[PDB]
From a paper:
Notably, a desirable concentration gradient of S1P which is achieved by S1P transporters, including spinster homolog 2 protein (SPNS2) and MFSD2B that transport S1P from the intracellular side to the extracellular side of cells, is essential for proper S1P signaling. SPNS2 and MFSD2B belong to the major facilitator superfamily (MFS), and specifically, SPNS2 belongs to the endosomal spinster subfamily. Furthermore, using proteoliposomes containing SPNS2, we showed that SPNS2 directly transports S1P, but not sphingosine. The cryo-EM structure of SPNS2 adopted an inward-facing conformation.
To overcome the difficulty of small-size membrane protein in cryo-electron microscopy (cryo-EM) structural solving, we developed a nanobody against SPNS2. Together with the NabFab10 and the anti-Fab Nb, we were able to solve SPNS2 in apo, S1P-bound, FTY720-P-bound, and inhibitor 16d-bound states at resolutions of 3.29 Å, 3.22 Å, 2.98 Å, and 3.18 Å, respectively, by the gold standard of FSC = 0.143. The hydrophobic pocket is composed of residues I411TM9 (superscripts refer the localization of the residue), I414TM9, I429TM10, L436TM10, L332TM7, I336TM7, F366TM8, L436TM10 and F437TM10. We also spotted several polar residues such as T329 TM7, E433 TM10 and Y120 TM1 at the entry of the hydrophobic cavity. The densities of the carbon chains are of good quality, while the densities of the polar headgroup are relatively weak, which may be due to the lack of restraint on the headgroup within a large empty cavity. In the substrate binding site, both S1P and lysophosphatidylcholine (LPC) utilize a similar hydrophobic pocket for tail engagement. However, the orientation of the substrate headgroups is markedly different. LPC points towards the lateral entry between TM5 and TM8, while S1P points towards the center of the cavity, close to the TM2 and TM11 sides. A structural comparison of the chicken MFSD2A7 with S1P-bound SPNS2 shows that SPNS2 largely differs from MFSD2A (RMSD = 4.16 Å over 328 pairs of Cα) on the extracellular loop 3 (ECL3) between TM5 and TM6. A comparison of our S1P-bound SPNS2 structure with the reported inward-facing state 1 structure shows that the structures are very similar with RMSD of 1.013 Å.
Numbering used by the authors:
A (entry chain R): 93 to 287, 299 to 350, 360 to 541
B (entry chain L): 4 to 216
C (entry chain H): 4 to 232
D (entry chain N): 3 to 128
Write the structure that this text describes.
Amino acid sequence: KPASLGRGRGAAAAILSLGNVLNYLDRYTVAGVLLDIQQHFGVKDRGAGLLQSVFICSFMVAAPIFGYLGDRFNRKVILSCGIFFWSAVTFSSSFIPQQYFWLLVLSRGLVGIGEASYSTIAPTIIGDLFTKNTRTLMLSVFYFAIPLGSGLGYITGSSVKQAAGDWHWALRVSPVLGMITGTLILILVPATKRGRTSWLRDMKALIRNRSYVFSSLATSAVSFATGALGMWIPLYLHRAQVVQKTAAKDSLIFGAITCFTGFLGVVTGAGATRWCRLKTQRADPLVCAVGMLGSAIFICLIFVAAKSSIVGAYICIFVGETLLFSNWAITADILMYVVIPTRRATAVALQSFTSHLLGDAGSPYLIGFISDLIRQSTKDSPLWEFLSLGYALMLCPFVVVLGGMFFLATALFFVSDRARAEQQVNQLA
Amino acid sequence: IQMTQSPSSLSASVGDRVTITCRASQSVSSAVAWYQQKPGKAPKLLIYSASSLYSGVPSRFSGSRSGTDFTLTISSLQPEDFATYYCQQSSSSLITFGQGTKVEIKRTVAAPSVFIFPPSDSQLKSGTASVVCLLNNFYPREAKVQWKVDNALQSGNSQESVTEQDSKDSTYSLSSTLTLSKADYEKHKVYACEVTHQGLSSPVTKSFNRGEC
Amino acid sequence: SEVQLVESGGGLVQPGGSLRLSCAASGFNFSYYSIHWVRQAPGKGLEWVAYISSSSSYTSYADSVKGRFTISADTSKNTAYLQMNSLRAEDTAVYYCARGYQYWQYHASWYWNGGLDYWGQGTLVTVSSASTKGPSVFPLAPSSKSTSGGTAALGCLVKDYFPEPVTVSWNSGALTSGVHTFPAVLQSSGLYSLSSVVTVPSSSLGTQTYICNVNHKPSNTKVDKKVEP
Amino acid sequence: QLVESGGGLVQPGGSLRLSCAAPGSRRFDYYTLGWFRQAPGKEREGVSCISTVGGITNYADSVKGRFIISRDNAKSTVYLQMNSLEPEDTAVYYCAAGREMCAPMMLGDYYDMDYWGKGTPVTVSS
Ligand SMILES: CCCCCCCCCCCCC/C=C\[C@@H](O)[C@@H](N)COP(=O)(O)O
């Protein structure tokens, strides 16, 4: 009913977009002050990697349950409860005594639990208020808040820490705006209507689809590399710059760089695939594979330039991020091309789960574990801390090359999978 | 671009057959669409592509092509089919409409009644003099009125108006007004209204003398 | 969904001024069609004015309004606008809007001609330098000049008013038979004038007096004038 | 864009054969087929479609048994063959290029085609 939509849809879209910005502003505030967290709690590289692994595991487990409860109960109540759920906990976790490291890990788990609800439920509301023509534009406006919040995380954390003089203050700002958004959503968002079944046949059919499996494994590789680098880059840059005796501007510059690479990579990928589709019908997997194999080379050069000059490292980071973030708007098309319309709702929900299981659930912890394992076998000094983190961070190009190989294997079966899908659909109806 | 229709008006009785024609000036040769308008309303599309009936229009209408002339046909003239019809054509990058053709009711001839009104005194008090000649309940519409002042013909100082066709008798009425200044009226003595119509055997003239009673 | 088009933005404009109209439509997909403008002078035929396809890249005007008018569209709200500059006395007419096919220049040829299917309702635009005035009344006295066949003719004059309309009645709605009220005429001075007459039996005037009632809302003047021999 | 061809004036009981072609070196293998039509007083509707790889055809309910669509990839052309035409077939006919699988109840939706043509009028006489 447009009669109330004339105000409700605009107000809801704006407030939910700001909610998404606040949602992503609180995942990367800890990555900005990881060095201070380590120096205060007195821990090592093994335990400083749990603070993102626990978050990701909790998000993994708690997303499908909220995705199910979102179509039995009132959605505004759940969104409001989650908002404060992830807010109040974030605020309360800044008073922890020095002897209680594990309590911070528990806090991060609870924050992840709340963010799962928000990020699973909000798109459904923002997509049930609009018709066939303007749903896509509003969804894009919702989605184009990931890079902005991601950069604002580093920038806010570093700036507040430097200005206040105590790292605790980095965790005491976003709850104030969360407590406002969680009240404004109760006012500006109109109520939206809600809504033996077997999903074993869906699984049994999806397992024998080679393109689907290979694309899922490639997405897992992308998640691995993205999580590891996004958590462990700024600390490595700081250590390297300390080694040269030429030095928190690193977080500022990294946030500024990612805020632009996020848009640039997606635009480049979309243009390239639109050009390529008119030459051959294997365009999407080949474009993705070329992107991965061209991003691995520029990723691998950070660890060589960082020993001699910093500006080269920044340029390599720019190019690597730009090429790596050029296959986030293509994989959904590969999924839609070879999966019949009745099995898509399952085939997405499964894939996301897998993308978190083989990907960024255990990657930062693995990097920290390998770093300490290498570190304990040699002398203790800043130079070996730098070289240890550098040598640990070399597993990412290997995984990226594996992802490229999987995209090629997808391009190998793309056409046969399409033909089978068409025969299935025309036999159903 | 200009289409000329033929004729500019016609009359037929209920149950008669009527045709209208549009002749094209330049090269289109089969692309003509027809419209219908009733007094004070928007037009309405009937036929497109010169032979295709629009959706929901009664099938008593039809169209065709002959040489370069486009003709419309109505096989049963109903009481609802008295309106004005137009042609449309877009042979260049421009669109042009025809001039119209009005279909009215057929009746029997009748002579008019002529009345002449001397100016009122209150009119003279404001410095203007107006005289009205009135035709009442005549048919057909075509009639001419000659203005005479002291047996001299006038020209270029009068206006006329016609009522629409009567809803009961299907007749017309006419009102002609001649204007003169106060001094011009006082400079003359005799005024007359001469009328010409098919129903009269000879022109009928009514006369008036200024200042008499 | 039923298709509807509505126009708004008319009124009175002094010579040499400007005015803006709009033809807002709903019920159909706005980007597959074009919008036309047609006008009809008082007592004359139809005339085509302008054109815009929904992409606002196709546009063509007529030879009578080239360089004076301008048309543009707003595809977000389903609304088209027409800007008129330097109006003359010949631009008094009712303006309609209609719907097109979006490619008629390309496939209007030997045998197609498309067609204008759904029309609006029309708004009225006036141009004049005259000011609002009140109508004066001068009755026509019945006599042997208008007496013929047992009945006599009498009537009233409504003169020098602007703008139209004016209503006329007899005995406050008591005498309605035999009444003919002619259309208004635009005099050279810009003021209108009409006459209304009625035929009544000659022997009636000896006992019954007739009064014509004039109502003019824009000037709020009412006159009751009695007609006597 | 795509370029249409064919279409004209036909008597009742006749037949006519329309064609769409891609310009230049574009190939349009990924997917580019489906014929639509529009009438003077109605809305745009789908008439037929064919599939990318196997050659599977689908027609609307009112044209089954009469029209026949075909695809030629060596020349990058699509053909439609129209038989036993009737006065209700007067319209303007379009080609389109989209991405959804060829299936029933997919025809009538035309908000998700990527490429459109300009149309070729067909007039059935009386
Ligand atoms: C080369 C260095 C790389 C540096 C990377 C910096 C960090 C960037 C991480 C960006 C992660 C964005 C993840 C994208 C989308 C997900 O959040 C949603 N689909 C989850 O929604 P759901 O599936 O729950 O609906």
